[PDB]
Amino acid sequence: SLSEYAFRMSRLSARLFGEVTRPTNSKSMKVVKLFSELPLAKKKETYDWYPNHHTYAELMQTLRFLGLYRDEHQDFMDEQKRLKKLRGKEKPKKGEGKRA
Amino acid sequence: VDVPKDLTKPVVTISDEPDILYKRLSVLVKGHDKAVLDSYEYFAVLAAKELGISIKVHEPPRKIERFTLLQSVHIYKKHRVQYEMRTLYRCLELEHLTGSTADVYLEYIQRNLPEGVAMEVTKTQLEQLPEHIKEPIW
Amino acid sequence: HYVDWRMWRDVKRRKMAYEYADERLRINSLRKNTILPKILQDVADEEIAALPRDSCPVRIRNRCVMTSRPRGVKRRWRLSRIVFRHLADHGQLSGIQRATW
Amino acid sequence: EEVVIPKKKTWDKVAVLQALASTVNRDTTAVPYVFQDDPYLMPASSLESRSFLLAKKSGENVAKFIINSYPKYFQKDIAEPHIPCLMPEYFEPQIKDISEAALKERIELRKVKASVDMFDQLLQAGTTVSLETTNSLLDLLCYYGDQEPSTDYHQFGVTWRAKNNAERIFSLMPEKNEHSY
Amino acid sequence: ETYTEDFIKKQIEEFNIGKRHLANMMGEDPETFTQEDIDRAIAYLFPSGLFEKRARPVMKHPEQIF
Amino acid sequence: KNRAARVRVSKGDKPVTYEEAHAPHYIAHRKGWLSLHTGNLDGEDHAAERTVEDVFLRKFMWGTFPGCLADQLVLKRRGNQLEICAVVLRQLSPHKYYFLVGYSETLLSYFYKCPVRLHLQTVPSKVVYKYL
Amino acid sequence: AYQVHGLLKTGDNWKFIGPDQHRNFYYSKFFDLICLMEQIDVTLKWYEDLIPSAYFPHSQTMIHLLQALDVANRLEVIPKIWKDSK
Amino acid sequence: TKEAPETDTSPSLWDVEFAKQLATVNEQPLQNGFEELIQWTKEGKLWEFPINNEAGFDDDGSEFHEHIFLEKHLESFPKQGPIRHFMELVTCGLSKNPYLSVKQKVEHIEWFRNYFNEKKDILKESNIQFN
Amino acid sequence: PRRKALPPRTEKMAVDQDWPSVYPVAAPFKPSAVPLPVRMGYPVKKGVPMAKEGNLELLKIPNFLHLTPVAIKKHCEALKDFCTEWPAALDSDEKCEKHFPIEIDSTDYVSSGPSVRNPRARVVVLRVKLSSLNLDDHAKKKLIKLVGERYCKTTDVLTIKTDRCPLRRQNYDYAVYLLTVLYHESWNTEEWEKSK
Ligand SMILES: [Mg+2]
């Protein structure tokens, strides 16, 4: 319990310092908190968590087609792909496959 | 024998508004190497003496942050690798500076902050009472 | 070009959740108090339950950004323990060493 | 007793740097700073001194050529504050509507072929072209002699031609002010 | 490990020459630059926190090294 | 038996560099960090974004100077600047090295929106610390 | 020539020396004149300052430095001049 | 010189092209490291020291009282009742949010204004007059 | 043939040169440009630390070759021009807080990366003693009842920390605004205060 003077004083301080002045229960003070920060989804760590993998692969792919980047991994996989084709183990054409 | 002539000096315009006063100006620096913080202390304390600033230095105690990880890709829960990150400190306590002295000195020591070193510059500025607080409105 | 389809499904979840965050915030605020009438809060319940399911932020998963692993990720680096260690053990993470004491 | 509070000196954002550069004179043991400082990359003749700087500049054109040819790979601003000069450049007019404002783009973008083609269509529409707008279009056509400035990738004799478009445009121009002449 | 006597003498030469450059950088008298001044200067110019001292940068007389 | 970043002993004939010759329990003891920034210091931010940048650059440089690098990159950051300190070999034309320095620097500065420099240090052959 | 060079080195005047062609021409001529009309000791001072710090010589300007060394009867330096020539 | 210049008139191609080659006069290769830091600072590539963590951010030139005092925007809402109570919590929280611009804050407030304006009937049934 | 590397220029360096010209700014250790026979590396058994050339250990040091004592003194001479003088009247901290009762704290955060932003920079702290203000008994009581724990009785300092606003500018302005309206309200005597 708080005296009327103690009560009317803490309400005056709250008005001054910009805190809630109406009596508000703890369940409704979430409204203040909700608008007092950013939504989790809006925070940079969240929406910008992943590197743009579309940009890192597409950039380094043209840099290889341009001759300015050597992709030892893609060279490896091309060689294997070339050999499998010789063995006859080539990818079938989509749709026009063995089955109907 | 080819020494240049008429060395052009930068324009330092003395203005007519007064200058900020800093009661003190604490400069904490944080690195992973202590020898690097020793060389940065030597540099910054000398730079302050060659500029007529009063400077004191102490070492705040270090922080060692450790965490554990699994050592294997799949099972073997009893086997861990543990890692740490040490943060070492040195606080440069400068005192009684004017805004322009600070401005020059910070810029200088900040541009020569070594790789892997961070700095937190607390500036305690001196100020006088706002006009509206001189006398009540009652 | 993401590591896999599970990462790709999280990339989309994170993006949709960002698009709707302001709407979701506003609707929650209505239904997160005792001030407003319940007939109104009940409408809000319906409204936010009708927003696309992939805008719900609890459906975001913090996967290794390099290998897409859904567990064992350190949040400061967004990497799985396998990937973190590989860089840490080669000396490639600034200031991170093996701990002994 | 009274605080003798001094006055705030001010300077430019390069001044302290310049104050520090004053303290150093060039190094005689070193080649110019634009070169790499390795015993094996240090130029060892005037020919190399020239050739090595062209190679470095050649690689920069290839970079700038890629950066401007694939803008999407370089449209993610991480810098604070924003650096306008490390962004890609866009040289194609983005407004296809026939309007006075759209004319300025082709003029500002020094696109001689786009401007004349748009000017022809615009003239057929019968819309009025401002004198200032027409004057600016003339400067571009005359300055380069109706020859498109070549950029990235897609002498002896008289280069001027009597049957050139610049001459024709003046005839079509209804009003010719002093700047036109 | 094959360090010919000639090899060492070329090392002592380089140390003496380097000793003088080090005193010059540090703004000290080349004629009174002791080893303890070499160590203090090298520690400042190449700061390393490596916990092992034998792994840190060093500039010693070739006879104390080889 | 531990495996991480250990080069095994073999038959006394394997050239290894000082970097390769040291196991992870020597990373603050007998050798340093191949990168230096402030992200992993107490109270600092963006350790993740620094780490993704460092994984790309090492990959970028390895394929951009194919067969030239003689050791690992040293990545440095000072404020807004980024320094790439490579040790390369002396087999490529210095014309080609200058092309690649100018190219990489430019391309990386527009990609990571910062001033990026690249300091080469040529060696004749890969510096051998030990024959494992 | 010392007045011409003296002017270039004042303030920010050195920025007017122009492209590489202009720069070699300037320093090539300037130094030829030094070797011919200057004391040998001061020619060696200008030799060390200008090359390769500011100017990569031409084949000729080595000859002039040789001749100036002969006129000064300082042949103990010719060895050094050969190394630099390479 | 001429008393009154043609300030309204703007430079032409000839003008700027001449300005470009007036600069080519003094352009020389960078001489040392200081010159590159100086060149980069002029180009805006390098940070300016001593650093301000808000260098480049002026926050739409807003003043403190536009973030902190948001009741002026509640003038279209009921002056009393549950809507006032509620909106007084939105603005209290908004007035404490250092991550939003004043424009973003006003968007939140304006949403609730449009939102409660659509639920008039719901609000009228519960005897809360909106307008 | 195969291009041969020139000799290091450390040989052409004079033992008395001015070293600041060689390394004017912060730059990575170059063996070919540093005339020191410095070795680094944990030695193999019956071996020596490794030579400077190709030594990746020396390239991992953030060196101080651009900041020798010579260089520093030279630098600071050119910078004395930029700095102004401390008011000789403000000798002691006693005199500082006599003439300047308010103190404003703020922090700047220097960190490496592409972005300079740091949300901790916005915070402003306003510190003042209540003995430096024009407060009677009445008002000194109400000011202390209004600020709560922002006031320390031991030191008599009232501390106002503000961080509501995006900018430090705006927060400082708010901190002053608060000290102001706190001072004027502590002087106003509402009628309900007779219920104490
Ligand atoms: Mg084990």
What is the C-alpha separation between I90 and I156, in angstroms, rounded? 22
Q: What angle do CA D27, D33, D36 make, to 5 degrees?
A: 120
What is the C-alpha separation between B96 and B125, in angstroms, rounded? 10
By the CB < 8 Å criterion, does C43 face chain F?
Answer: no
Asked if the structure places residue C16 within a domain, the reply is yes
Asked if the structure places residue C96 within a domain, the reply is no
B119 contacts on F by Cβ (under 8 Å)? none
Please answer whether residues C22 and A39 qualify as being in contact, where contact means their C-beta atoms are separated by less than 8 angstroms.
yes
What is the C-alpha separation between G24 and G60, in angstroms, rounded? 13
CA distances from H69 to A75, H74, H82, H91 (A): 63, 11, 20, 8
By the CB < 8 Å criterion, does B28 face chain H?
Answer: no
Q: What residues pair up with B98 in beta bridges, in sequence order?
A: B21
DSSP annotation of D34 reads: T
Calculate how close chain E gets to B117, using CA atoms only, in Å.
13
Asked if the structure places residue C60 within a domain, the reply is yes
Which among I116, H31, D22 has a CA at the least distance from the CA of B12? D22
The encoded tokens of residue E30 equal: 């080349």
CA distances from C96 to B66, D63, I113 (A): 10, 34, 18
DSSP annotation of A48 reads: T
Across the interface, whether the CB atoms of A4 and I142 are under 8 A apart is answered no
Picking from F100, F110, F118 by the largest number of D CB atoms within 10 A of its own CB, the best residue to mutate is F110
- H or E element: which one contains D126? none
How deeply is B69 buried, as exposed, middle or buried, from its count of CB atoms within 10 A (0-12, 13-18, 19+)? middle
In this structure, the number of other CB atoms found within 10 A of the CB of residue I11 comes to: 11
Residues in chain G: 86
DSSP annotation of A42 reads: G
Name the neighbours of A, counting chains with at least 3 Cβ pairs within 8 A.
C, D, F, H, I
CA distances from B97 to D12, D113, I17 (A): 21, 63, 36
What is the C-alpha separation between G70 and H70, in angstroms, rounded? 90
Please answer whether residues F129 and I44 qualify as being in contact, where contact means their C-beta atoms are separated by less than 8 angstroms.
yes
Q: Which residues contact B44 (CB under 8 A, 6 or more apart)?
A: B27, B55, B92, B109
H90 contacts on C by Cβ (under 8 Å)? 29
**What residue ranges in chain I does DSSP mark as E strands?**
102-110, 124-129, 157-162
F114 contacts on H by Cβ (under 8 Å)? 45
What φ, ψ does residue A19 adopt, rounded to 5°? -105, 170
Chain Cα centroid distance, residue D177: 29
Picking from H45, H51, H52, H53 by the largest number of F CB atoms within 10 A of its own CB, the best residue to mutate is H45
Phi-psi region of B11 (alpha: psi -120 to 50; beta: other; left: phi over 0): beta
Q: Which residues contact F109 (CB under 8 A, 6 or more apart)?
A: D86, F115, F116, H45
Chain Cα centroid distance, residue C51: 17
How deeply is A68 buried, as exposed, middle or buried, from its count of CB atoms within 10 A (0-12, 13-18, 19+)? buried
Please answer whether residues I160 and I179 qualify as being in contact, where contact means their C-beta atoms are separated by less than 8 angstroms.
yes
E58 contacts on B by Cβ (under 8 Å)? none
DSSP annotation of A88 reads: T
What φ, ψ does residue H114 adopt, rounded to 5°? -70, -35
> Whose structure tokens read 């040289």?
D91
Asked if the structure places residue C58 within a domain, the reply is yes
Please answer whether residues D134 and D115 qualify as being in contact, where contact means their C-beta atoms are separated by less than 8 angstroms.
no
**Alpha helices by DSSP H, F1-132:** 47-64, 94-111
What is the C-alpha separation between I83 and I86, in angstroms, rounded? 10
By the CB < 8 Å criterion, does E35 face chain F?
Answer: no
Please tell me whether the peptide bond between H50 and the residue prior to it is cis, using omega within 30 degrees of 0.
Answer: yes
Amino acid code (one letter) for B6: D
Chain Cα centroid distance, residue F56: 11
- Helix, strand, coil % over all residues of chain B, rounded to 5: 25, 45, 35
The encoded tokens of residue H92 equal: 């209290």
> Whose structure tokens read 């529409």?
D125
What is the C-alpha separation between F83 and F81, in angstroms, rounded? 7
What is the C-alpha separation between F27 and I42, in angstroms, rounded? 12
What is the domain count for chain C?
1
What number of H helices and E strands is found in chain A?
5, 0
Across the interface, whether the CB atoms of H33 and I121 are under 8 A apart is answered no
**Cα of F1 from ligand 1 centre, angstroms:** 6
DSSP annotation of B8 reads: P
Please answer whether residues B19 and B97 qualify as being in contact, where contact means their C-beta atoms are separated by less than 8 angstroms.
no
Please tell me whether the peptide bond between G52 and the residue prior to it is cis, using omega within 30 degrees of 0.
Answer: yes
What is the C-alpha separation between F25 and B83, in angstroms, rounded? 10
- N- to C-terminal Cα separation, chain D: 73
Asked if the structure places residue C52 within a domain, the reply is yes
Across the interface, whether the CB atoms of C95 and B69 are under 8 A apart is answered no
What is the C-alpha separation between A61 and H41, in angstroms, rounded? 34
Which among C95, C79, C71, F84 has a CA at the least distance from the CA of A51? C79
Checking B64-73 for CB contacts under 8 A at 24+ apart, the result is: B64/C99, B64/C101, B65/F42, B66/C99, B66/C101, B67/C74, B69/C72, B69/C74, B69/C81, B69/C84, B69/C85, B70/C72, B70/C81, B73/C82
What is the C-alpha separation between H17 and H28, in angstroms, rounded? 19
What is the C-alpha separation between C74 and C79, in angstroms, rounded? 6
- N- to C-terminal Cα separation, chain I: 101
Find the helix packing angle between D165-172 and D131-143, rounded to 10°.
170
CA distances from A59 to A62, F53, F101 (A): 5, 14, 19
Asked if the structure places residue C101 within a domain, the reply is no
Resolution value in angstroms: 2.4
Asked if the structure places residue C99 within a domain, the reply is no
Asked if the structure places residue C83 within a domain, the reply is yes
Which among B102, G16, D16 has a CA at the least distance from the CA of H41? D16
In this structure, the number of other CB atoms found within 10 A of the CB of residue H67 comes to: 25
How deeply is I113 buried, as exposed, middle or buried, from its count of CB atoms within 10 A (0-12, 13-18, 19+)? buried
Which among F38, F33, F130 has a CA at the least distance from the CA of F72? F33
C98 contacts on B by Cβ (under 8 Å)? 81-84
- H or E element: which one contains H74? none
G48 contacts on D by Cβ (under 8 Å)? 28
Across the interface, whether the CB atoms of I19 and E24 are under 8 A apart is answered yes
Instruction: Kindly list the residues of chain G whose beta carbon comes within 8 Å of any beta carbon in chain D.
Output: 20, 24, 48-49, 52-54, 56-58
By the CB < 8 Å criterion, does I41 face chain E?
Answer: yes
The encoded tokens of residue H117 equal: 């304006």
Calculate how close chain E gets to I19, using CA atoms only, in Å.
6
**Cα of B80 from ligand 1 centre, angstroms:** 8
Could you tell me the residue range of the domain that residue C58 belongs to? Answer: 1-91
